[PDB]
């Protein structure tokens, strides 16, 4: 499995603009909610879930990274695997996207895969 | 269990006005008293306990991200489960609030589970 | 044992104005000194050992907290357990005093046991 | 092994520009983009991979350096072993690098094997 | 064994002006660069190895200790103990100072062992 792997999806020039901590099923889990750093377009959600997912090795790390690009507001691309979470409520309330990846973006490029 | 099962309670809008660590029992604790950013309502007291409770796995995570919130003071949703902690000294300076979620928010929502 | 239990001592209105970090007996360990933030009494100097005394769990936590405070400057209370420490030059240089808490205060009040 | 063993490659003056996290194989994994403080040259890219190389035991000082550094945007050397990662499209989007060192560039020169 | 012990050598008012992270015989490790605040005398070069020598327990602790001072600019006093390190290009590129401790510093006196 690889971050960059195109059944992956990805959404570049975001601004990761909303980020939240929780536990579920003695799992420790956050999610992040990023928009387009224009404003266009339609939020992104995803979570990471400590224990859970073939994700779960990069909890820490992503949490990590993600804090440091929600404390600067920078634009970086977010890669997703999509149909991963199925508790039904906390789809509801977020989604049901594994967060993968985060790369920083130039206003050129972004720096991951693509 | 869930941050969001909806026998916990939440406080939409608070901000982290004060921060405490110590241990008791055998475990570190934080607890945090947060107020409405709007200056409405009552402060809210919550813990999180290390290798307590359902709520031990994710102490580290919420420890951090309590100590993030506090430092930029920005209005948070605070997730938490009542009549958890039960020492009576400990619950009288603080209260029996488990810590199970923290969520920022914007100026119409917050980034988490409500009813 | 708890922080607050009434045979600890507590200092109010402190600010944490230094920090050590060093090891001892196999053990890392760290040391503080904090003052009263109105520039009266006396200076308060305990410290924390990694694998000794029963507050050695909470060794890592009050290291982080004690770095918080002491990079904010704000006013806190700090909460020790007397005559702990009795290496005799490790006393003289800092003191016997095991850190047990930390609390920020407000103007009036502090958020912790009293 | 060592960071300073000539087999090694290093590149001074650098400041990373960019910065991505991930997953590859059960590891998380992050990579970095430098490029020189004056703007010539073409920039060196590197990865560390968790758990993957010899180098793997540094892969969270490494990760939490070059966060540093990036956060900072000083001026650095970069210190990679060339040929280590294999996974094609990995290597075709970031490169075949291993991250194996970071040193400060600031005053007399690059504090690092040199 | 003791961060104050005579055995061990200190420099006071010093400032952490270079820092490097990287790995050596599977063993992360990383050195400073420090030098008097007033500019006077000869820069003071020390390492920890996580793994290595004695003071290996207190490693993590001294790198984010390092890390902090090294942010910050201030004045601080290094603890070392000299003689430790033993691989010749390693010694002859930092040096064999052993890093045993960090004490932040008033403008009167430092708050460490002397
Ligand atoms: C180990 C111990 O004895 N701990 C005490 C601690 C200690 O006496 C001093 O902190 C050491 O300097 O004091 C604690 O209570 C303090 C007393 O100073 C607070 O009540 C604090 O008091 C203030 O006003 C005081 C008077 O109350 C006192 O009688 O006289 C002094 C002058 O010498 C002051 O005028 C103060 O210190 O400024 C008022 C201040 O608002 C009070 N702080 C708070 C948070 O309410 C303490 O440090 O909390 C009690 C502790 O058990
Ligand atoms: C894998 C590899 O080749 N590593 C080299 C590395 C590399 O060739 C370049 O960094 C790629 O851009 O270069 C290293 O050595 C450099 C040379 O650039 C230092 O000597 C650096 O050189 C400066 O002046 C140089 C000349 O010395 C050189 O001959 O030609 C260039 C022309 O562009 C410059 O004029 C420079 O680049 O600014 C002077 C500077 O002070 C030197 N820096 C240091 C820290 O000494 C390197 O990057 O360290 C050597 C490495 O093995």
Redo the contacts between chains.
């Keep these: 499995?690889?971050?960059?792997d195109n059944t992956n999806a990805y959404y570049s020039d975001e601004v990761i603009?909303?980020?939240?901590?929780?536990?579920?099923?003695?799992?420790?889990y956050?999610?992040i909610?990023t928009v387009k750093a224009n404003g266009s377009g339609t939020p992104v959600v995803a979570c990471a879930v400590?224990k859970q997912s073939?994700?779960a090795?990069?909890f820490?790390?992503?949490?990590?990274?993600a804090?440091?690009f929600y404390?600067t507001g920078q634009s970086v691309r977010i890669?997703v695997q999509k149909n991963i979470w199925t508790?039904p409520?906390?789809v509801n309330?977020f989604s049901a996207n594994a967060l993968?990846?985060?790369?920083?973006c130039?206003a050129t490029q972004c720096?991951?895969?693509?």
């Design positions: 499995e690889w971050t960059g603009s909303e980020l939240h901590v929780g536990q579920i099923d003695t799992s420790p956050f999610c909610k400590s073939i994700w090795p990069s820490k790390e992503l949490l990590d990274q804090r440091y404390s890669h508790y409520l906390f309330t993968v990846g985060l790369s920083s130039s720096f991951g895969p693509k």
